[PDB]
Design a protein around this ligand. Structure first.
Ligand SMILES: [Mn+2]
Ligand SMILES: [Mn+2]
Ligand SMILES: [Mn+2]
Ligand SMILES: [Mn+2]
Ligand SMILES: [Mn+2]
Length: 391
């Protein structure tokens, strides 16, 4: 092995400017980091700067440096979709032709009709809403009618809420599995169906810990599958395991926040493993991108950057750190959807004694997967070109 351990960090939605095909997606003008840097009157990310973020692209407060710690470039998405599952699946060696869909005005009548026809239950709600709003609104109606509350959100999800004392948990799960089958349909293709059981009384409804998720498996066997099958460690941190529906994962560490995510990354640096440690930092997307909150997004980026020197201190000569993103989600952009953007790539190891250089632009996210596979001597993915020997 050239590297014993690879630490891959996805800063979820942290895009570095409109992609060549951004017009197809209604994403002309998008620029996640650049618009944030503008809003902040200069982002303070000195450690990402030291790695070479500004060498990729200069932005307010993010300048190029003469001797970046590692190698740097950006990546272009080849898959059709700009959603989380597409980006992550591509990163780990796949190509996804069929995009996952999001439903801001609610789900189509035809899908809901087929769900009614299969379940014998009425559907109410059908709108993007918080777990608090639809419950407050329609929780009482649900209790009195045995109807299902269907709701969505800014991401590719279909949520089914029902009171545990009105619809038994087992029945809610059966219903969600049916919905999961019906949404394996390109017209209605959602990343995840979510059971949202709740208890309580009107004006005091609470969601229970009995949530279950029904995800689609990646459309192909990934570099993670191949690592796991060759007896390497694949440690998933945060949403990573759910994103791949557990495929190729040997250990999964739950996280509650970006800072918690960084703590778990630090924990894996303390572990004697051989293989991949894979972190998703989701707050960027979930709390700030979709809520179009450039200030919160800016602060979160600064909070993340401040954690980095501890990571640098723990990396060994035969460790590689890879930092990237899975799409954009520009918080100064119309609507609530992701943005089709290039993503940054930084590749750093303490063994890089002379610092890094510019890498050729990565023409697919799968170049990461290809690099990982070549490093560990496993079957190369069908998609992606390794940059391992460029390092
Ligand atoms: Mn757009
Ligand atoms: Mn994402
Ligand atoms: Mn998202
Ligand atoms: Mn169908
Ligand atoms: Mn610790």
């Amino acid at each position: 092995n050239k590297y014993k351990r690879i630490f891959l960090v996805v800063m979820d939605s942290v895009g570095i400017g409109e992609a060549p095909d951004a017009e197809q997606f209604g994403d002309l003008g998008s620029d996640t980091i650049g618009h944030i840097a503008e809003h902040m009157n200069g982002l303070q990310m000195p450690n990402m700067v030291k790695l070479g973020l500004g060498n990729i692209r200069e932005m307010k407060g993010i300048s190029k440096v003469e001797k970046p710690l590692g190698y740097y470039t950006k990546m272009q998405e080849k898959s059709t979709g700009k959603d989380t599952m597409t980006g992550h699946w591509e990163i780990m060696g796949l190509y996804i032709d069929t995009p996952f869909q999001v439903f801001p005005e609610g789900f189509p009548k035809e899908l809901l009709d087929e769900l009614e026809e299969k379940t014998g239950r009425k559907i109410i709600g059908n709108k993007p809403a918080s777990g608090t709003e639809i419950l407050d609104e329609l929780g009482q109606e649900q209790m009195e009618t045995g109807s299902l509350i269907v709701y969505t959100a800014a991401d590719s999800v279909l949520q089914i809420a029902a009171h545990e004392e009105v619809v038994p948990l087992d029945e809610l799960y059966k219903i969600c599995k049916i919905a999961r089958e019906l949404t394996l349909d390109e017209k209605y293709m959602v990343g995840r169906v979510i059971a949202r059981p709740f208890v309580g009384e009107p004006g005091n409804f609470t969601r229970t810990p009995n949530r279950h998720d029904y995800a689609l498996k990646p459309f192909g066997r990934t570099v993670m599958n191949e690592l796991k099958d060759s007896d390497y460690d694949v440690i998933a941190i945060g949403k990573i395991s759910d994103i791949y529906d557990g495929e190729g994962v040997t250990e999964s560490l739950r996280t509650k926040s970006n800072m918690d995510g960084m703590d778990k990354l630090v924990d894996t640096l303390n572990m004697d493993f051989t293989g991949l440690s894979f972190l998703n930092l989701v707050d960027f997307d979930a709390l700030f991108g979709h809520r179009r909150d450039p200030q919160g997004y800016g602060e979160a980026l600064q909070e993340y950057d401040a954690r980095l020197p501890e990571v640098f201190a723990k990396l060994k000569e035969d460790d590689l750190l890879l930092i990237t993103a899975d799409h954009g989600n520009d918080p100064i952009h119309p609507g609530t959807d992701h943005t089709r953007e290039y993503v940054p790539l930084l590749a750093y190891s303490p063994s890089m004694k002379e610092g890094g250089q510019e890498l050729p632009l990565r023409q697919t996210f799968a170049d990461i997967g290809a690099t990982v596979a070549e490093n560990f001597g496993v079957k190369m993915p069908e998609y992606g070109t390794s940059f391992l020997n460029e390092l």
